[model samples]
Target chain A: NTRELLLDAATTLFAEQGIAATTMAEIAASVGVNPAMIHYYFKTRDSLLDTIIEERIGRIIDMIWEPVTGEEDDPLIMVRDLVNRIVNTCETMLWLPSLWIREIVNEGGALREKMLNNIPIDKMNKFSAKIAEGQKQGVINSGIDSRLLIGSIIGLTMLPLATAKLRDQIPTMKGLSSEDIVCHVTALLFTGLTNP
Target chain B: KNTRELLLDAATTLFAEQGIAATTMAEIAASVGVNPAMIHYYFKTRDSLLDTIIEERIGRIIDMIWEPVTGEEDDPLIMVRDLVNRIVNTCETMLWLPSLWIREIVNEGGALREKMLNNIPIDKMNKFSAKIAEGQKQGVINSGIDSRLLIGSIIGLTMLPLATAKLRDQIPTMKGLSSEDIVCHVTALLFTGLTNP
Candidate 1:
């Protein structure tokens, strides 16, 4: 709880002003600390933001991937479980989406690549490999590139939410909770965006 | 008052925040500190405002990239690189072009929307397609892949960075970023799967 105040202050300000726009002094003032203390604690604003993202991303991704990899069960159940985990985490996941999306835009050189390749793909490949295993076991359909299928499934899942233009155009989607949207998407993916 | 500038500012923000069809004359007027009735003083209708935006955007885009396209530049990758670079530069300077373009895309069956889709140089999708074809001819691009698929991948590569502001505002908890790093990563990723050994 020592630096919890700093994390809390930074998160709110970053949300309101965006990562590029917010300043460290503002973060310090919000936390009721000397501005220099942030330098002592996190060294830089980039470090502070990365530290926060690392904590949240790891927890949420692990929680979801655990069920997929740990159980060693049917792929359909694994997919269903992963969907539920994603939807649930999103309800409380807060800034992960914003940070990830922002990072995607800027992509931010090697460090950003290091962070992304380490986190999302590792988990995604594990889950997708499990799906590939399912196809082999006759629990899922065959003849799809497990990786590409995962890419499209993930694309269908995330791309709609990422684009403001798309979100506004689809009225039926405007009010649905992220959970229901994932369920609808999961059913569609399991059913069609694949061959029978 | 150049009525045209006011109309451009109004349409730029509203269309970016909301798609063309969804933005109303009343809202655009409110943005310009006037009443909806005054929209007629310059442009007669909302469709005209959209047409104006499309015309301005297309002209600028064509002028910026045409030099490389006309074979003024030799590197096959130059067109793709410039397309990515110019967009970043435009977003920084204009800051409103992308949102406006995206809104125009999603507008349903509006005349202005149809005009943007059909008339814009982007409809050619030449920069990406031509690069793929050249790379294929040179044995640098994967011959098995379809050009359209490569186009979509190129789109996916840069879409996030292009829409960063909107993405960060609506969702929270992103790392505070260094802008230099953002540009570098997109450049690397695009050139990564794109260029052949």
Candidate 2:
């Protein structure tokens, strides 16, 4: 239980201040524990971050692929479901975007390589095969790059939350509540796929 | 460059690279070859320095792109493509903007987020959205899609490639393409999808 508390603290701190800026003592203070106890549970700061990505992000990725993994579902429907679910996931898990941007998007980011390795590449490959299947059935656009299509879907679904704190003030983005984002992105992604 | 200008430049570089929390006043001063106290003398706090960067650099560029197209264009397809082109051009020229934006405005809930939002031109966005609605009515763009969704599509298509430029290199399935190539691909993709089939 204490380990979970410490891990939650570390996730919050890292998501808020970035891993480079967050410290072990702060995580300890956040959990109202002694710094020595952190060493007892995680052994090192790197291990704590490692465990967070493996435990948190890895699990999230698995859950993300769950509904869409149905082989019998229509690819277009499946992709739309994937987009909607991912938007909800990112919305409920607010810390995800900030952590993803800080650790994955930035150059030489601390967790970039680790997270890349941990991404469900095999699952993604399977998803890509579904797109290819749709192409064969003449339902999806054969011209579109399936791999890049996945990236675009990800960008459309997830990137908005990266700026959730500023969405209210953004002119084009104003009044786009999280639900609005999900609806809009789902429609746009399906449009991009079904026709183009 | 003067002390103030040098300090701002150094701060921008450091902020783009390491983000606000990770970057230190001392590092900025060191990069500019000044005493750490000199940073406070000019900017008072690190936050102010960041504010100045947002207002001076980021605000100016936002104006540069949005100002010219505040009014609706005659042809919606041409206007949308042009907008995408300009955005891609901005990303290529201002390589630091995406990194700075993701690190500051997006990630840490940077101090400049509010200020940046206030500067967004609401009327211009509505005008563009209206233009999109008109395009749909005229059967130029897809009638099934909403104006706001069209705008979101544009932003998602353009901004994603820029933000994930580095990650492209790491992934085998992704390519290390230039912004120009991305603009072309995204434009073609959107055009076919948004236009009446």
Candidate 3:
């Protein structure tokens, strides 16, 4: 349990000050444990650092994809469900956006490469295939680059939360709450899908 | 050629690149090959120098993007396209803005988040959003979409490409995006639902 406590401390410190800048001793002390005990548990900084990023980010990515049982075959449901769930993930997991922006969004952050691997690209490829399916059925736009669609959806869902700390200060954005953001993206994405 | 202009120039590059908080005031001047005192002599304080950058450099980007857009355009769609073009153009020209935006504005507890947000003319976005509403009323744009949120769509579409540039280069599927490629992608998505038009 103290190992989990130490990991929690490390993740918290990692998010706050960044992983590279945080020392194991600081993480250890934050939880009121001796620095030697950190090694006693996690073995080394490399091991602790590896688990902090892998567990924190990888676990979150797992949860994001967890609700999809593969039977929900419709692209609309697929996309909409993902949007709602991702937004739900953002809303519930308040630590994500700050960490997302600092590490994952930035080029050289510790979580950057792992984020891509943990992104479940196969699932995305499947999602893209669904879009392709919709295109074949003459439902989705053929003009849309299927790969970029994921990025757009991600930016739409994730961008708001990255600025959640200060978004409300901007006059128009201040009024657009988290629920509004979910409603807004779903509306744009679905209607943006509607064939004119 | 003035030390003031040189200092300002150095400040812009470092602020955008190294980050505002990360770069010491001395660092800015040293980059300009002057003593730290020179910065104080010219700009008065670090905060004051940043204010100037926010004004002349940062505000200029916003003005360049949105200032030319007018509600007088007959088609809201045209306005949307034009807005996208300007945004793309501005980002391409000021390559630092997107990365800076990701770091200092979008990043939580970012150094310049409040400072930058304070200057954005939300009224321009509101006016633009209103035009979208008009288009919907005129039965031109999709009725089901919220007019106001299209502003966020434009931001998402335009900002993400450049912000995630390194990742784009790394991923095979998302490689080789030119500025023009981005503009066309954003413009199309803004107008048509990713469904058949």
Q: Number of the top candidate by DockQ?
A: 3
What does the lDDT come to for candidate 3?
Answer: 0.76
Pairs in clash, predicted candidate 3: A141-B194, A141-B195, A192-B193, A192-B194
TM-score of 2: 0.84
lDDT-superior candidate, 1 or 3: 3
Best by TM-score: 3
- lDDT of the candidates, in the order given: 0.53, 0.74, 0.76
Docking level of model 3: medium
Model 1 residue A102 CA deviation in Å = 0.7
Local accuracy of candidate 1 as per-residue lDDT tens digits, B1-197: 77567867777776666545456877888887877777777678666766766677556654564444543335655566776676666566766655544333422222344565345444345555666566667765444444433333444434434554444333323334444545564554344321111
**Model 2, A53-144: lDDT tens per residue?**
78888888889986656374577677777887788788788878778877777774788878877877777888888887777777776556
lDDT order of candidates, top first = 3, 2, 1
The runs of at least 3 residues in candidate 3 whose Cα sits more than 4 Å from the true structure, single-residue gaps closed, are: A20-39, A66-73, A114-117, A193-196, B71-73
* Chain A only TM-scores, each candidate in turn: 0.76, 0.91, 0.87
When sorted by TM-score, best at the front, the candidate numbers are: 3, 2, 1
RMSD of each predicted structure? 14.8, 3.6, 2.8
- Colliding residue pairs in candidate 1: A95-B172, A95-B173, A99-B174, A105-B160, A105-B161, A106-B182, A108-B181, A108-B182
User: CAPRI verdict on model 1?
Assistant: incorrect
Descending-DockQ candidate ranking: 3, 2, 1
